[PDB]
Amino acid sequence: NPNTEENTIDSDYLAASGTVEAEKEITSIDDYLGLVFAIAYVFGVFFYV
Amino acid sequence: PLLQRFYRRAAANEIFTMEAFYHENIENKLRNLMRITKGQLEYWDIHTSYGEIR
Amino acid sequence: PLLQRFYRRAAANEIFTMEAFYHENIENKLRNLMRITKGQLEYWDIHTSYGEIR
Amino acid sequence: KRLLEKLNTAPQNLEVENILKRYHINYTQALIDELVDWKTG
Amino acid sequence: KRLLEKLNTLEVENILKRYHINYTQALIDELVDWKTG
Amino acid sequence: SRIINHLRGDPVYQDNTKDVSLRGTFLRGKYDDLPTMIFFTEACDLTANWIPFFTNPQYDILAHRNVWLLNPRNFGNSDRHPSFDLQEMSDDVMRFMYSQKISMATLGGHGIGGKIALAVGCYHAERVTGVFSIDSSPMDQRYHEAFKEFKGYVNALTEINFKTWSDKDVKVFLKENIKDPKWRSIFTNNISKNAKTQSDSFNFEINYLNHNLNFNKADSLGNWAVKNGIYTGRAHFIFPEYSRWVHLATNTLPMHKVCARVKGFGHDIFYVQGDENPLNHWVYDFENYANVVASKLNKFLHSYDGVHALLKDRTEIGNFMIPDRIKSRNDSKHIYGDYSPAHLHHNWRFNHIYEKHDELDKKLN
Amino acid sequence: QAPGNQDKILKWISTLSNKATTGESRSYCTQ
Amino acid sequence: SSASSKALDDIENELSFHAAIWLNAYADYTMFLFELEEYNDPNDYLMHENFDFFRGLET
Amino acid sequence: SLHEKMQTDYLWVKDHSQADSWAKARTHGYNYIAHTVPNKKERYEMIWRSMGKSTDWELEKFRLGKK
Ligand SMILES: CCCCCCCCCCCCCCCCCC(=O)OC[C@H](COP(=O)([O-])OCC(O)COP(=O)([O-])OC[C@@H](COC(=O)CCCCCCCCCCCCCCCCC)OC(=O)CCCCCCCCCCCCCCCCC)OC(=O)CCCCCCCCCCCCCCCCC
Ligand SMILES: CCCCCCCCCCCCCCCCCC(=O)OC[C@H](COP(=O)([O-])OCC(O)COP(=O)([O-])OC[C@@H](COC(=O)CCCCCCCCCCCCCCCCC)OC(=O)CCCCCCCCCCCCCCCCC)OC(=O)CCCCCCCCCCCCCCCCC
Three-state secondary structure string covering chain F: CCCEEECCCCCCECCCCCCCCCCEEEECCCCCCCCEEEEECCCCCCCHHHHHHHCCCCCCCCCCCEEEEECCCCCCCCCECCCCCHHHHHHHHHHHHHHCCCCCEEEEEECHHHHHHHHHHHHCCCCEEEEEEECCCCCCCCCCHHHHHHHHHHHHHCCCCCCCCCHHHHHHHHHHHCCCHHHHHHHHHHEEECHHHCCEEECCCHHHHHHHHHHCCCCCCCCCCHHHCCECCEEEEEEECCCCCCCCCCCCHHHHHHECCCCCECCCEEEECCCCCHHHHCHHHCHHHHHHHHHHHHHHHHHHCCCCCCCCCHHHCCCCCECCCCCCCCCCCCCCCCECCCCCCCCCCCCCHHHHHHHHHHHHC
The ligand 1 site (C-beta within 6 Å) comprises B 1-4; I 66-67
Q: Which of H37, H38, H44 sits opposite F312 (nearest CB)?
A: H44
Instruction: Mark whether E and I touch (3+ CB pairs within 8 Å).
Output: no
Q: Strand, helix or coil at G6?
A: coil
Is residue F52 within 8 Å of E18, Cβ to Cβ? yes
| Degrees to nearest 5, angle at CA F292 with I36 and B14 | 35
CA E31, distance to chain mean position in Å, is 11
Instruction: Count CA atoms within 13 Å of residue H40 on its CB side.
Output: 20
Is residue F256 within 8 Å of F249, Cβ to Cβ? no
The answer, for A5 touching chain B at a CB cutoff of 8 Å, is no
* Contact yes or no for I48 and B14 at CB 8 A: yes
Nearest to F147 by CA among F180, F120, F190: F180
Q: Alpha-carbon distance F153 to F43, whole Å?
A: 12
DSSP designation for H55? T
* Contact yes or no for I42 and F252 at CB 8 A: yes
DSSP designation for C39? H
Instruction: Mark whether F and E touch (3+ CB pairs within 8 Å).
Output: yes
Identity of residue I20: D
What is the CB neighbour count within 10 angstroms for residue C26?
Answer: 10
Q: Alpha-carbon distance F71 to F41, whole Å?
A: 7
Nearest to F138 by CA among F264, F253, F301: F253
Overall resolution, Å? 3.1
Total beta-carbon pairs less than 8 A apart between chain F and chain I? 21
- Experimentally, how was this structure solved? cryo-EM
Nearest to F62 by CA among F93, F42, F37: F37
Q: Alpha-carbon distance F26 to I21, whole Å?
A: 58
3-state helix, strand, coil in chain G (%, to 5): 65, 0, 35
Q: Alpha-carbon distance F62 to B30, whole Å?
A: 23
Nearest to F217 by CA among C12, C11, C14, C25: C25
Chain E neighbours, 3+ Cβ pairs < 8 A:
D, F
Beta bridge partners, F271, equal: F239
* Contact yes or no for F3 and D28 at CB 8 A: no
